[PDB]
């Protein structure tokens, strides 16, 4: 593989107008933007507002023993649909051609990227009118390159026509101008009843036990909530669930009888109808039935009425309508929300209680919630839709409470037929929910009345620091489990238990405290987020040998088949396996039909559907075929081996398929799947480490977490970026050793480092403890040469507290202007020259007030001489405003200074130690001074043998002119990679082991031993941005007279009184920090009741201090107010730290005082 150079230049010069040259970056960001696309289209918000329901209001008449309290004027309102229009420009016509707002401007003008939100409010006047009205409800942010931005479908050339760079990615809502993003979280599986062995259950309900069954059921609008089954020691099962932040606990027999019109024989023969009279199950179900018979009633109507009369309070249900329908409202809204039909909720509840009882008796292993087998991902747009539906539901409840209060007062205005009344009430309440969503995005504190089944309520959004390309991608791929686990320090899920092979990367994960939590997805792991219709799955199952009954059509051997939380039939495990296999082959074959020419009807069975066959075995996972069709799962591709085409599979068939990892590993009759190429298991940033399978994997972990922090090219459109701190590399190149995916993923547009001619040698002596040198002339000819951009913003609208109109303005007041600095930098307008070099104490902008007319100034706080490259006069808003914002982008320069970390692509970070002169460096027979001397002692105990191979490959590829392929897992044990590159080199002419005969520079005669010179890829780091502070003397503290906030104490004191250095301790702590000579009353022994004498005589002698607490012409004295005293003569000087005087103060304010004696 060669460097695409001609193609690179012909994609740089004339950019493509057809379609983005790099499809894989877009398939990498596709989760978020396709989730938002699913939000707008595919009927997602519409389902949300339908399932909101309708809310009623009326005039309440007290029943007064009537029982049917009357109410005639009833209005029942609902939201019909939601529309999100494209982001126009301050919708109100500003007397211009109303044009769009491309996000470039939202980054420039430092304003969020919002768009109108239209709701379709609907009426009912307890008749049938249903007149409608569209309501603006504020403006919500909108994802860049989403379905509702003005960049969708645009080709790169039309993006260069705008101000965003050619290969834009999208996925991030622009909020105030800082690209916020919703991180992917990990949740339990949708609808699949999992088991739980968690000990916290035990002390929860003391009659309870640890064994439980949890299920996170989700509605069609992806608005899940949980409801678990507690198995209590007595024998019955409790149906725990959540509502309005509060747990709620009703016995499972209660809702089992309340759901369908059932008789108890049906419950029994459904739970345990099998193997008639199995001991454990039979007695437990008997005990349960009787324990419910204890207090309850018989029929379904009585149970529903009791349930309503119990739960009418907490449900937001209509106050007046009826009572049994409230029971139906529970059994519709809470019990099992994913299912629609009551009889089917009943069937799944029987199956679930059977699974619980099997788990209790040890016939079923405990599924593990901290493993990707039972985990899915929540995207961004789905969380956005949930929060938008929650805000809409709150808005409806709020206008409902406003109507109820309006009616309740006495009757100020009550006209449920008049539209004027509705205009009044809408005008009353807060109608702006755009700012709620914008606040969730600006902060992250998800402030909702119900948590939507989310453990943690903080930290949902990450700011997309474009510092370096890998950093941007790594933002887009990652996931996270939530700090609710980080606070628990355990050898738990932070472990890499292996149902992740190909889903989430093994190596790429930060080091330190968050290690193991945020696992970035693999390279190829997609996220299926557009579900499809599956009715042909029940049709085909019924055709294929399974049948769902009405009365118990179930026996011993028959296992269950489950369609994303709906029991569709029962079949023996042999037939279950046959059905699984034939479904898989039908899916694959019709997919290969659908991709090419043959017609694309709605797919019989979609690819994304996963056929999770769970074989039976004693003490295993509970066996039953599981058919999932939900969105927001993880799904990756493999090659089906009987056929020869794609097939997609998720983290539920992983654990039960023999996916042979090579064409050569496949063992016949068993291995039914092949991995495309094992490179498919790593992530995107981790895969780009040449020979990544030679290093000790901690080195690859450090290299991922450190290549996410290189001073590299953060893009190509930098002139149009309003970020605070950008870093750019002047001289970058493509690596000479590279993985093909470094070309596929379009990294060529964003280089990170240069190619250093590294000599492994211990010669200078400065390069121990991991440091290194940098050939001086190889530095002064332009080695890694950074430029930092610090853009700071000035806003006069802050210093306008309240009371006056706009006063401050940019410029100089009509009048005088100092020449000594202000006219040197600032042009005339108070805005600095473009290109004038600033220093620390230098003025940068100038504004004056109107009243005082005096020109104020703002100075450059940073301590390093920077230039000025671009100033933006931000128009405040839509129009009709003065320049009330400026944005100045200083271009600081940062060459390699002693202390700036360099680090190859193996975790080999160093520090530029001295910068040896180019004459005192060694040289080969050829004459190239090695650009960087690394130390040989750093490779043992580090195992970066990958670096030796990479240096070999670099010196080989640079010679002939190849782009040495370095994908993980190509080179086997038969012929080693080292031998391949050695053949390369010996063809070129150099030494085969890579050595090279060098002469030393400081002596001239050759080094006895040959030395190892290669061409490594050195990406300069940027951790040196916060380097130094020397304090001779300065300000002191207000209270304790201490140096204001270096720290010496509480461990430094240990060291000093360890050395036996009394005088050094008393110096550094008491002398140099805070020293004072305070007077002390010797007799009364206190330090505060002393006072200097006043007005003793003329200038004369010294003011001879006296004491007050010890008191009662020469000796007597007066006070400031004139009060005379006598006595209190014994006053002397003592030396005690000022902090002790402050302690005396705060102590006497408590009336407790120490009387320190003096001799």
């Amino acid at each position: 593989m060669s460097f695409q150079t001609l193609e690179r230049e012909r994609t740089f010069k004339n950019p493509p107008k057809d379609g983005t040259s790099f499809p894989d970056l877009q398939k990498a960001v596709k989760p978020h933007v396709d989730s938002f696309n699913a939000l707008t289209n595919a009927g997602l918000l519409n389902y949300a507002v339908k399932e909101i329901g309708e809310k009623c209001a009326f005039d309440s008449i007290t029943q007064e023993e009537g029982g049917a309290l009357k109410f005639g004027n009833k209005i029942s309102f609902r939201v019909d649909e939601v529309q999100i229009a494209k982001p126009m420009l301050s919708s109100r016509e500003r007397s211009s051609i109303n044009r769009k707002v491309y996000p470039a401007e939202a980054r420039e003008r430092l304003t969020t990227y919002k768009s109108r939100l239209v709701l379709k409010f609907s009426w009912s006047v307890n008749g049938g009118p249903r007149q409608s009205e569209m309501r603006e409800v504020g403006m919500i942010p909108i994802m860049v390159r989403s379905n509702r931005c003005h960049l969708e479908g645009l080709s790169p050339a039309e993006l260069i026509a705008h101000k965003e760079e050619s290969e834009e990615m999208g996925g991030y809502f622009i909020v105030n101008g800082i690209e916020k993003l919703i991180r992917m979280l990990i949740l339990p599986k949708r609808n699949h009843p999992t088991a739980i062995i968690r000990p916290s259950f035990a002390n929860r309900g003391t009659s309870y036990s640890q064994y439980g069954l949890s299920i996170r059921c989700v509605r069609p609008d992806q608005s899940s909530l949980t409801n678990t089954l507690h198995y209590l020691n007595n024998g019955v099962t409790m149906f725990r669930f959540h509502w309005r932040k509060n747990e709620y606990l009703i016995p499972s027999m209660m809702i089992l009888k309340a759901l369908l019109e059932t008789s108890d024989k049906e419950i029994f023969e459904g739970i345990v109808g099998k193997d008639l009279g199995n001991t454990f199950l039979t007695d437990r179900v008997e005990l349960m039935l009787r324990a419910y018979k204890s207090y309850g009633l018989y029929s379904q109507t009585e149970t529903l009425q009791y349930l309503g009369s119990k739960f009418r309070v907490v449900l937001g249900v209509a106050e007046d309508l009826t009572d049994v329908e409230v029971g139906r409202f529970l059994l519709q809204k809470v019990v099992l929300v994913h299912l629609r039909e009551a009889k089917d909720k009943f069937r799944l509840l029987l199956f679930m209680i059977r699974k619980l009882y099997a788990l209790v008796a040890g016939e079923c292993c405990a599924d593990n919630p901290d493993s990707p087998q039972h985990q899915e991902i929540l995207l961004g747009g789905f969380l956005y839709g949930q929060i938008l539906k929650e805000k809409i539901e709150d808005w409806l409840n709020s206008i409902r409470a406003q109507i109820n209060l309006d009616v309740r007062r006495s009757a100020p205005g009550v006209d449920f037929s008049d539209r004027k009344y509705l205009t009044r009430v809408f005008s009353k309440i807060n109608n702006d929910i755009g700012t709620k969503l914008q606040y969730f995005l600006s902060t992250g504190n998800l402030v909702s009345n119900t948590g939507l089944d989310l453990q943690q309520a903080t930290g949902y959004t990450v700011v997309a620091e474009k510092l370096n390309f890998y950093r941007f991608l790594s933002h887009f791929r990652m996931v996270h489990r939530g700090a609710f686990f980080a606070e628990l320090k355990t050898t738990t899920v932070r472990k890499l238990l292996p149902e992740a092979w190909g889903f989430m990367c093994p190596v790429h994960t930060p080091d330190g405290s968050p290690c193991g939590l945020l696992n970035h997805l693999a390279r190829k792991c997609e996220i299926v987020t557009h579900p499809s219709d599956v009715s042909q799955i029940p049709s085909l199952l019924l055709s294929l040998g399974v049948d769902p009954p009405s009365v118990v059509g179930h026996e011993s051997g028959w296992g269950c088949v489950q369609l994303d939380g709906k029991i569709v039939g029962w079949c023996t495990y042999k037939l279950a396996k046959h059905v699984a296999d034939v479904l898989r082959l039908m899916k694959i074959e019709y997919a290969v039909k659908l991709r090419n020419g043959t017609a694309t009807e709605p797919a019989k069975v979609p690819l994304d559907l996963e056929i999770g066959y769970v074989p039976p075995s004693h003490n295993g996972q509970y066996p039953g075929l599981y058919l999932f069709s939900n969105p927001a799962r993880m799904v990756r591709p493999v090659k089906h081996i009987s056929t020869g085409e794609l097939d997609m599979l998720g983290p539920f068939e992983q654990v039960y398929m023999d996916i042979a990892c090579f064409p050569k590993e496949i063992v016949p009759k068993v291995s039914t799947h092949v991995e495309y190429s094992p490179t498919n298991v790593l992530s995107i940033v981790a895969n780009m480490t040449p020979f990544s399978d030679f290093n000790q994997s901690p080195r690859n972990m450090y290299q991922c977490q450190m290549g996410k922090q290189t001073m590299g090219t953060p893009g190509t459109a930098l002139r149009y970026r309003t970020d605070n701190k950008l870093y750019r590399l002047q001289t970058g190149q493509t690596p000479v050793v590279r993985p093909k995916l470094h070309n596929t993923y379009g990294l060529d547009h964003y280089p990170n480092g240069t190619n250093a001619v590294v000599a492994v040698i211990s010669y200078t002596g400065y390069d121990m403890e991991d440091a290194m040198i940098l050939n001086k002339s190889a530095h002064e000819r332009g080695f890694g040469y950074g430029t930092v951009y610090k853009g700071e913003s000035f806003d006069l609208s802050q210093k306008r507290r309240r009371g006056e109109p706009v006063v401050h303005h940019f410029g100089f007041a009509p009048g005088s202007t100092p020449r000594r600095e202000w006219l040197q930098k600032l042009d005339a307008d108070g805005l600095p020259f473009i290109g004038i070099k600033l220093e620390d104490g230098d003025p940068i902008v100038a504004y004056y007030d109107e009243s005082t007319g005096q020109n104020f100034i703002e100075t450059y706080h940073g301590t390093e001489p920077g230039f000025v490259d671009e100033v933006r006069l931000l128009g405040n808003d839509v129009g009709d405003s003065e320049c009330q914002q400026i944005h100045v982008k200083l271009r600081i320069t940062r060459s390699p200074i002693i202390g700036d970390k360099f680090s190859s692509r193996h975790g080999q970070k160093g520090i530029c130690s001295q910068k040896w002169p180019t004459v005192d460096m060694p040289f080969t027979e050829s004459g190239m001074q090695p650009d960087i001397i690394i130390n040989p002692h750093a490779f043992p105990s580090r195992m970066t043998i990958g670096m030796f191979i990479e240096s070999l490959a670099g010196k080989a590829g640079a010679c002939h002119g190849l782009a040495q392929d370095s994908t993980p897992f190509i080179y086997s044990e038969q012929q080693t990679a080292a031998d391949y590159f050695g053949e390369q080199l010996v063809k070129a002419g150099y030494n085969y082991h890579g050595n090279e005969p060098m002469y030393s520079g400081i002596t001239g005669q050759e080094m006895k031993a040959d030395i190892y010179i290669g061409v490594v890829y050195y990406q300069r780091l940027r951790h040196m941005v916060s380097d130094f502070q020397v304090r001779t003397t300065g300000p002191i503290h207000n209270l304790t007279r201490q140096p204001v906030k270096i720290r010496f104490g509480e461990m430094e004191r240990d060291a000093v009184i360890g050395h036996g250095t009394s005088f050094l301790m008393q110096d550094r702590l008491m002398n140099c920090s805070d020293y004072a000579q305070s007077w002390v009353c010797r007799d009364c022994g206190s330090i505060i009741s002393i006072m200097s004498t006043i007005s003793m005589n003329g200038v004369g002698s010294a003011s001879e201090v006296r004491c007050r607490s010890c008191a009662k012409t020469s000796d007597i004295w007066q006070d400031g107010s004139g009060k005379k005293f006598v006595g209190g003569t014994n006053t002397t000087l003592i030396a005690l730290p000022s902090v002790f005087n402050y302690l005396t103060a705060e102590l006497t304010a408590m009336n407790i005082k120490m009387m320190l004696e003096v001799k």
């Binding site: 401007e105 420039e108 940019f810 805005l831 020259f833 473009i834 004038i836 128009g875 009709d880």
Partner: protein
């Protein structure tokens, strides 16, 4: 009077102090200042 650049249209605006800021020909609301003629030196290092 100063000479600026409308961000999008790239048109010399000639807007004066304490005035309504916007592009005279497009209506855009972002203005860069232009780099005038001024003498600076840098060592060739």
């Amino acid at each position: 009077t100063m000479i600026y650049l409308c961000a999008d249209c790239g048109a010399r605006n000639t807007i004066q102090a304490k005035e309504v800021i916007r592009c005279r020909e497009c209506g855009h609301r972002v203005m860069y200042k232009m780099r005038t003629k001024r003498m600076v030196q840098f060592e060739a290092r």
